[PDB]
Amino acid sequence: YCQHFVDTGHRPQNFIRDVRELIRLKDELIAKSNTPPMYLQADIEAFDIRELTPKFDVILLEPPLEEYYREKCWTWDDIMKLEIDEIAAPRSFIFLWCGSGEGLDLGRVCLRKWGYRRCEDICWIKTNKNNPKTLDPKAVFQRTKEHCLMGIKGTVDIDLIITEEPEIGNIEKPVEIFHIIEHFCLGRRRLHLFGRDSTIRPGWLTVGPTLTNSNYNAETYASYFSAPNSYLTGCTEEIE
Amino acid sequence: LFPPQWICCDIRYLDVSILGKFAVVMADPPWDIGTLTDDEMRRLNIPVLQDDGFLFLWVTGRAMELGRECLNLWGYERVDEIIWVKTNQLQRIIGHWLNHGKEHCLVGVKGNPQGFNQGLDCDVIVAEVRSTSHKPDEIYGMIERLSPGTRKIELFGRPHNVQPNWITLGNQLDGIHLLDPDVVARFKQRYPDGII
Numbered sequence: 222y223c224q225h226f227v228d229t230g231h232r233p234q235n236f237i238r239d240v241r242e243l244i245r246l247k248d249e250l251i252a253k254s255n256t257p258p259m260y261l262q263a264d265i266e267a268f269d270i271r272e273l274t275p276k277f278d279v280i281l282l283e284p285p286l287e288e289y290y291r292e293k294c295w296t297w298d299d300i301m302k303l304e305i306d307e308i309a310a311p312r313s314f315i316f317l318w319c320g321s322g323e324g325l326d327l328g329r330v331c332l333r334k335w336g337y338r339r340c341e342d343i344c345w346i347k348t349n350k351n352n353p354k355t356l357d358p359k360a361v362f363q364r365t366k367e368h369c370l371m372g373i374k375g376t377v378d379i380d381l382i383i384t385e386e387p388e389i390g391n392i393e394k395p396v397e398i399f400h401i402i403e404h405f406c407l408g409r410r411r412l413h414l415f416g417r418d419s420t421i422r423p424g425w426l427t428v429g430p431t432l433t434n435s436n437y438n439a440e441t442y443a444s445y446f447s448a449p450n451s452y453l454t455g456c457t458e459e460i461e
Numbered sequence: 462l463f464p465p466q467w468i469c470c471d472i473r474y475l476d477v478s479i480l481g482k483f484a485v486v487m488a489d490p491p492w493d494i495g496t497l498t499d500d501e502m503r504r505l506n507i508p509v510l511q512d513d514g515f516l517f518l519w520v521t522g523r524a525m526e527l528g529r530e531c532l533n534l535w536g537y538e539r540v541d542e543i544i545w546v547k548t549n550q551l552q553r554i555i556g557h558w559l560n561h562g563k564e565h566c567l568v569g570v571k572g573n574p575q576g577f578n579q580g581l582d583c584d585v586i587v588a589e590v591r592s593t594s595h596k597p598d599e600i601y602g603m604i605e606r607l608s609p610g611t612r613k614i615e616l617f618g619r620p621h622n623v624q625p626n627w628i629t630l631g632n633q634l635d636g637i638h639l640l641d642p643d644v645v646a647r648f649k650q651r652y653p654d655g656i657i
C-alpha cells in the first residue's frame with residue numbers, strides 16, 4: 222500500500238475496511254447524565270483562565286495552529302503559557318490536538334508543564350478517496366494524520382479515528398473525539414477550549430473567541446455538580 | 462557491497478565506529494517498558510553512525526517520550542512520525558485506556574542531508590501483522606525510495622530483517638557476515654581474534 226500510494230496517490234488508509242451492542246445503553250446513560258450545553262465567547266489570550274469554575278474533570282484543548290491554515294493563529298509559545306493547571310481538577314484528563322509537526326513534541330512539553338502524563342496518543346488518520354500537497358520544509362514524508370494527546374494527572378475504543386480529509390480551510394476536528402472522550406466516563410465537568418458555535422454540545426462547556434453567543438454563568442454551571450451529583454462519572458443513572 | 466550483511470553482537474559493547482557512516486539508521490530497541498535500561502539506551506554510540514541523514518526509531522508506551530529524549534540527545538531533531546495501522550488479511554483494524562491499533566516510528570534528521578526524495582511516501586503504513594513483534598516490510602521500501610542505493614544500518618534487527626544495502630546488528634543473528642571491503646578491514650583491525 223506504500224508502493225501503491227506512490228503509484229496512484231491513494232493513501233494506504235483508503236483501503237482500511239469497516240471504518241457488543243451495549244455501547245448504546247452507555248451512550249444513553251451519557252445522554253441522560255449530560256448537563257445543558259454551556260458556552261462563552263472569550264478571547265483566551267486576554268481572558269483570565271480562573272474565572273472558569275469549578276475545576277474540570279476533562280479538558281479538550283484545540284488551539285488554532287498555524288499549520289491548520291497552510292492553504293489569529295496560536296503558536297506553541299502562546300499555548301504553553303496557558304494556565305491550564307489552574308483550572309484542572311487534581312484528578313483530571315486532558316485531550317490536546319497537536320497537529321502533525323512540532324506540536325507532537327511541544328504538545329508533550331505542555332502536558333508535562335501542566336502536570337499530566339501522556340497515556341494515549343489518539344491518531345486522526347485522513348483518507349483521500351475523493352481526491353487521489355505542499356510539505357513542511359522539515360517534512361520527510363507527506364503528512365496525512367493529526368495527533369490528539371491524552372494526558373492524566375492524579376490517580377472499548379481504539380486509538381484511531383479514520384475519516385476523509387476535510388475541504389481546504391475546514392479546521393473542524395472529527396466529532397468522534399467526543400465519543401472517545403465521553404465513553405471513558407471521566408466525570409462531568411468537561412471544558413472545550415477554542416471550540417466554536419459548530420462544536421457546542423450537551424455535557425460540555427465551550428469557551429472560544431469566535432462564539433457568537435454566551436450563556437455561561439459560573440454559579441449556574443456549578444449548580445449542575447452540587448451534591449448529590451458531585452462525583453458522577455457521566456455514565457451512571459441520574460440521582461433521584 | 463549491495464547484498465545483506467550482519468553482525469551478531471551485543472550492541473552495548475560493539476565499537477560501531479568501525480562501520481562507517483550511513484545515510485539512514487533504523488532502530489527498534491527493546492525498551493525497558495533481553496532489554497536495555499534507559500541509561501544504556503542514552504549511552505548508545507548512535508552519534509558516530511551518521512553525519513547527514515535520517516534516523517527511524519520505533520517506540521511504544523513510555524518510550525514515546527524516552528525515544529524522543531534519546532533522539533534529541535543523540536543529535537537529531539524529530540521531523541516526522543510514521544504510524545503503522547495494524548490490520549488482518551481482510552484490511553480490518555485489529556496503554557490501558559484504549560486498545561492500540563497502531564505502532565509509532567519516530568523520524569529524526571541530523572546534519573543537512575541532500576539528494577533525498579522527501580515527500581514520496583506518506584506517514585501512514587497499512588499492513589498485516591505478520592509474526593509477533595515484527596515491524597512491517599513496507600518501511601524498507603519507504604526508506605529505499607527516500608534514499609535509494611545508500612548505506613543503511615539497522616540496530617536490534619533479527620534474521621528476518623536483513624536486507625540489501627543494509628547492515629543488521631542484533632544478538633540473534635547467525636555470526637558475522639560482512640562483504641563491504643572497508644568494513645571488513647576495520648573489523649579485522651579492531652577485532653583481530655573475532656570476538657567483541
Ligand SMILES: CC1(C)CCN(Cc2ccc(N3CC(=O)NC4(CCN(c5cc(NCc6ccccc6)ncn5)CC4)C3)cc2)CC1
Nearest residue numbers: 470471472489490491495496519564594595596617631632
Ligand atoms: C514495530 C514494533 C511493534 C516492533 C516491536 N517493537 C518492540 C520490540 C519487540 C521486540 C524486540 N526484540 C526482541 C528480540 O528477540 N531481539 C531484539 C532485542 C535483543 N536484541 C539485542 C540486544 C542487545 N543488547 C542487550 C542485551 C543482550 C543480551 C542480554 C541482555 C541484554 N544487543 C543486540 N541485540 C536483538 C533484537 C529485538 C524489539 C522491539 C516495537 C515496535
